[PDB]
Design a protein around this ligand. Structure first.
Ligand SMILES: CCN(CC)C(=O)[C@@H]1C=C2c3cccc4[nH]cc(c34)C[C@H]2N(C)C1
Ligand SMILES: *[C@@H]1O[C@H](CO)[C@@H](O)[C@H](O)[C@H]1NC(C)=O
Lengths: 289, 127, 355, 106, 119, 107
């Protein structure tokens, strides 16, 4: 039965994000410039897990009809787009920051500050809102006014240009940046290790970790957008078959949001040290000649 | 100038099947639904079904599920309705029509009128 | 007299050293000599080795989230104490001979020489997040026991001590700093002229700096404000070459100079560490283990030539700025020196009434 | 906190004699002590710091020595100007602690 | 060269009293300021201390929470504010100066003031 | 299903008169639409959204509505207004039409 299986995926997202938010906000040992960006990412994932997935599950449970009043549909679409775009751009920004830190270590420490974190947060959220704004302006078109007998979805005829350009802007532009940054960072690591007698293993292990982290993003978010572009740009292709695949593929992108916080929080030692502390709650001498 | 054209009168024997066509002109033809209606001589109107051209989605009336079939051709710009197993009761005028729609933004919802009815065609069954 | 001794965790190896601060004259550096006491019964056939190392370390908690730590070596030296090298033929200092006479025959000496041009000991301010080790140049002396040098050493047979390399103020005072500047605006009516000076060159830690300012304005403008600041410059070479600047003391005066007028004033400033805790990357003198230390002192170099093989280089400057309302600014900089005087007794290496 | 014990409390000496005063500490204060002299009705004056160094301008008759945790002050030749009270202070740890003080009488 | 102490005790049975000291020839950022109390028929004691370079103030256990120490750079003065006096706090007070780099001893002393607390 | 009942079936009105026609519903609906048909001609939209006149309709006609009650009235009757009127709803499937009301002249 689908309900219990989906609920045991809905719950971990909320739990994991809430733990991170509480931990960051509570203790001063974890309060500094970098952690605020992770707080923003946790907020985005929590808002994804709180509003979108329950309503999507409700629409799956019924015969794809719309139970809530009619006016609420454009708001739901707008929230979905906004939250997903915000999460993706947060991941891209984290990757770029990591590369800049590795390339020049001393400059990064001086430039890093609280004001820079605020500026970055504001920029990312402004981009997400600007991308997601146009959807409620052009409302959906329906044959009847009864909510019980219609279905909420972005039809090709009304939103073809928006789907094409939003797919290009939301996903592929970050993808190119991550792809180039990975190679640049790995190349930097190899040359740096070339010059500077026992730190080789650490650099190699870090390179492996970065590769795995990149693969996780690519695998989770690629098929849905590939299918969406194919559906838009292929007239000969059968629409029903593509829609059946798309409805399945959206859920992997949804699960990515729950998966994301663990990778970034668990490897960090300070979080585990604070958890342990809260759960709990040779010498140079002398001689006279 | 939106125009709809239909085939001429038909006389068919009892126990046969025949298709009727509706050809559109003056608009996209893939952004609006097509409805089919039947009017008996000196009687009220009845609703048969509607079809959405781009993906072929259809909705049917319960009383006419067995009798009627709906199809479309995008390149030729034609809509077809097929009737099978005809009886004496089924002899009336048939209309293909395009109806208005409702647009709902986040503030309000409103209806835009684009209704236009093509002239019907007569079908008779006799032996 | 006092001698500093340390023992290995197992306790077989003990190292005696005379002092922890070695003065760096420009031409030459004090030798590093000492004694090591060993137990022959425990040593079947292994040897005792002594190593001096100068290292540049930089670790970040953000990097430490991954497996990242940066360390580079600038100077390495090695010596074999026991068994004694066959050549021997090395003179001994008086303290070494006294130590050997007091101890038994098992004690053996060691000596190191440092070349002239190497960086001094400097650390960088950690900041609230960093709570691990330190960042900057460090000097260490380590004695271990090994059958061969290539073999991996263990904690049981190793002793580690930290030493320092410092500099003190020169005896002869330098000349008096001064500076002069003239500026012409868009219309060639008249120039604006600014002159600034300091009291003297060499300043000790915690002493006031007096700046004399003399301005004359003959243009059709208005001077809104005057700003006096003291700035630290640090040059670092770790995988890159870079410069870094920080203001340490500031002062803002709202004195207005009318057209066709003159103005003269004297200002006083002091650089200190009480209000510079939040600034990150500030340079400091250098710590043995986690104690407060003053601001970093100037680095003295041989004037004829320079070769960039050094980690961190520190210097200071004083800036005077006039703000012009209609348009533009005027600025002037002067150089000075900030160092300790020579002490009669060795500095304490901790808080003296320590809490 | 460290408790410092000083002896002898009171002594009488004639001109030209040599006198010794001793002090002891519960823990090792690591050679960081100072000796002060106070005449009646006036503030104290520093005499010896670092347990061996003699303050500038002090006559060389005064000497200080350390052995273990025992610190001793010695005056070789006594003069009429050398009758006062003498205090011993340690400053390795906070709070700093003074001794009882001993009186020299003619 | 000289430390001048003022604000003598005004025979306060209970309340607040402010003692001030003025220094000549000393820079506050290069020295540490200490207060030393001497009771009648007793040895010296330690009361409070301040260092301005790092910005630190230390008090004794007995007077913690009732005494405060501060210094002002503009006028080169040091203040001790005393609250909730008792019968035990009757003594002669002294102000003393040390060296910041590095500590040797209390080398310059003040003249001292008399403070008396009576019923 | 939503069943619509239209009254009266046949009515007579002399030129220069005001008349009304009623359409009732089985269940509550939001809005109702009205069509007019002449003999030998396909029907044409006449009033939509329960009050608004379609383009070309004169000013005489008017509409009134509420939940399970709707009506169409004319200010002054004229000779050119003899035809058949239908009321439909566009709320939920399947769509339904009224029986129809026929208007005649009286002399
Ligand atoms: C199955 C139907 N749904 C849900 C109602 C979608 O297709 C959503 C439509 C999205 C969408 C369309 C067009 C452009 C875009 N950029 C970013 C997204 C996006 C997000 C994307 N969400 C995740 C799914
Ligand atoms: C349309 O909605 C009505 C509301 O009661 C419902 O009865 C009807 O079955 C719906 N049409 C469907 C499900 O085709």
């Amino acid at each position: 039965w689908a309900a219990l299986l989906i609920l045991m995926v809905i719950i971990p997202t909320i739990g994991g994000n809430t733990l991170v938010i509480l931990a960051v906000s509570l203790e001063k040992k974890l309060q500094y410039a970098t952690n605020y960006f992770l707080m923003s990412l946790a907020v985005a994932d929590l808002l994804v897990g709180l509003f979108v997935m329950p309503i999507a599950l409700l629409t799956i449970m019924f015969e794809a009809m719309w139970p809530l009043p009619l006016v609420l549909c454009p708001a739901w679409l707008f929230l979905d787009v906004l939250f997903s775009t915000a999460s993706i751009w947060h991941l891209c920004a984290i990757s770029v920051d990591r590369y800049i830190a590795i390339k020049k270590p001393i400059q990064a420490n001086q430039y890093n500050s609280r004001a820079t974190a605020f500026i970055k947060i504001t920029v990312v959220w402004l981009i997400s809102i600007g991308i997601a704004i146009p959807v409620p302006i052009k409302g959906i078109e329906t044959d009847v006014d009864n909510p019980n007998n219609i279905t909420c979805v972005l039809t090709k005829e009304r939103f073809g240009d928006f789907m094409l350009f939003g797919s290009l802007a939301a996903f592929f532009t970050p993808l190119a940046i991550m792809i180039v940054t990975y190679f640049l960072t790995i190349h930097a690591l190899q040359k740096v290790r070339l010059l500077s007698r026992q730190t080789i293993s650490n650099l190699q292990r870090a390179s492996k970790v970065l590769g795995i982290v990149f693969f996780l993003f690519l695998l989770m978010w690629c098929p849905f957008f590939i299918t969406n572009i194919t559906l838009v740009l292929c007239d000969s292709c059968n629409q029903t078959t593509l829609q059946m695949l798309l409805e399945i593929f959206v859920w992997i992108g949804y699960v990515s949001s729950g998966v994301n916080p663990l990778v970034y929080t668990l490897f960090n030692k300070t979080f585990r040290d604070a958890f342990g502390r809260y759960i709990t709650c040779i010498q140079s001498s002398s001689i006279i000649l | 100038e939106v125009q709809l054209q239909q085939s001429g009168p038909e006389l068919v024997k009892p126990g046969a099947s025949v298709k009727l066509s509706c050809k559109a002109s003056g608009y996209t033809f893939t952004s609006s639904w097509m409805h089919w209606v039947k009017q008996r001589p000196g009687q009220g109107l009845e609703w048969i079904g509607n079809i959405y051209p781009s993906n072929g989605g259809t909705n049917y009336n319960e009383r006419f599920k067995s009798k009627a079939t709906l199809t479309v051709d995008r390149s030729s710009n034609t809509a077809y309705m097929q009737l099978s197993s005809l009886t004496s009761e089924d002899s009336a005028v048939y209309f293909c029509a395009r109806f208005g729609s409702f647009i709902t933004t986040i503030l309000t919802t409103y209806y835009n009128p684009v209704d236009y009815w093509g002239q019907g065609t007569t079908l008779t069954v006799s032996s | 007299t006092r001698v500093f001794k340390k023992a290995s965790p197992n306790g077989k190896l003990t190292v005696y050293l005379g002092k922890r601060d070695f003065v760096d004259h420009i031409d030459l550096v004090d030798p590093v000599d000492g004694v090591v006491l060993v137990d022959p019964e425990y040593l079947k056939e292994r040897r005792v080795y002594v190593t001096l190392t100068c290292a540049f370390r930089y670790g970040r908690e953000d990097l430490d989230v991954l497996g990242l730590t940066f360390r580079k070596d600038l100077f390495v030296a090695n010596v074999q104490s026991f068994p004694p090298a066959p050549e021997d033929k090395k003179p001994l200092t008086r303290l070494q001979e006294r130590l050997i006479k007091k101890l038994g025959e098992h004690a053996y000496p060691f000596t190191f020489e440092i070349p002239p041009n190497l960086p001094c000991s400097v650390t960088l301010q950690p900041g609230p997040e960093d709570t691990g080790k330190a960042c900057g140049v460090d000097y260490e002396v380590k004695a271990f026991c090994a059958e061969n040098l290539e073999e991996k050493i263990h904690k049981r047979n190793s002793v580690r001590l930290v030493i320092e390399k410092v500099q003190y103020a020169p005896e002869r005072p330098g000349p008096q700093p001064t500076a002069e500047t003239t500026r012409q605006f868009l219309m060639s009516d008249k120039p604006l002229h600014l002159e600034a000076s300091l009291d003297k060159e060499i300043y000790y830690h915690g002493e006031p700096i007096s700046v004399n300012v003399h301005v004359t304005n003959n243009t059709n403008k208005t001077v809104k404000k005057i700003k006096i600041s003291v700035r630290q410059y640090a040059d670092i070479c770790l995988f890159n070459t870079a410069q870094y600047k920080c203001p340490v003391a500031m002062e803002e005066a709202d004195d207005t100079v009318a057209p066709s007028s003159t103005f003269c004033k004297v200002y006083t400033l002091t650089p200190f560490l009480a209000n510079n805790r939040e600034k990150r990357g500030l340079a400091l003198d250098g710590k043995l283990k986690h104690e407060d230390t003053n601001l970093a002192s100037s680095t003295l170099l041989r004037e004829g030539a320079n070769r960039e093989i050094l980690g961190i280089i520190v210097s200071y400057k004083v800036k005077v700025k006039l703000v012009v309302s209609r348009g533009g600014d005027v600025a002037v900089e002067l150089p000075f020196t900030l160092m300790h005087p020579k002490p009669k007794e060795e500095p304490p290496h901790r808080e003296v009434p320590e809490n | 906190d460290i408790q410092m014990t000083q002896s002898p409390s009171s002594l009488s000496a004639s001109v030209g004699d040599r006198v010794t005063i001793t002090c002891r500490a519960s823990q090792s204060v690591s050679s960081a002590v100072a000796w002060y002299q106070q005449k009646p009705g006036k503030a104290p004056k520093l005499l010896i710091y670092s347990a061996s160094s003699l303050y500038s301008g002090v006559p060389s008759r005064f000497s200080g020595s350390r052995s273990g945790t025992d610190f001793t002050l010695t005056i070789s030749s006594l003069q009429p100007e050398d009758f006062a009270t003498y205090y011993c202070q340690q400053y390795k740890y906070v709070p700093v602690t003074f001794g009882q003080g001993t009186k020299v009488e003619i | 060269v000289q430390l001048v102490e003022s604000g003598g005790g005004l025979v306060q049975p209970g309340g607040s009293l402010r003692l001030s000291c003025a220094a000549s020839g000393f820079n506050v950022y290069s020295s540490s300021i200490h207060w030393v109390r001497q009771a009648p028929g007793k040895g010296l004691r330690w009361v409070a201390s301040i260092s301005s370079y790092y910005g630190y103030t230390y008090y004794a256990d007995s007077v913690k929470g009732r005494f405060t120490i501060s210094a002002d750079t503009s006028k080169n003065t040091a203040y001790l504010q005393m609250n909730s006096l008792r019968a035990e706090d009757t003594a002669v007070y002294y102000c003393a100066r040390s060296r910041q780099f590095w500590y040797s001893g209390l080398d310059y002393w003040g003249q001292g003031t008399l403070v008396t607390v009576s019923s | 299903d939503i069943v619509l009942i239209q009254s009266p079936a046949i009515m007579s009105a002399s030129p220069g008169e005001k008349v009304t026609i009623t359409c009732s519903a089985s269940s509550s609906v939001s809005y109702m639409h009205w069509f007019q048909q002449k003999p030998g001609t396909s029907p044409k939209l006449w009033i939509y959204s329960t009050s608004n006149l379609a383009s070309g309709v004169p000013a005489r006609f008017s509409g009134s509505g509420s939940g399970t009650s709707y009506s169409l009235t004319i200010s002054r009757m004229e000779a050119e207004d003899a035809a058949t009127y239908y009321c439909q709803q566009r709320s939920s499937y399947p769509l339904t039409f009224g029986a129809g009301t026929k208007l005649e002249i009286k002399r």
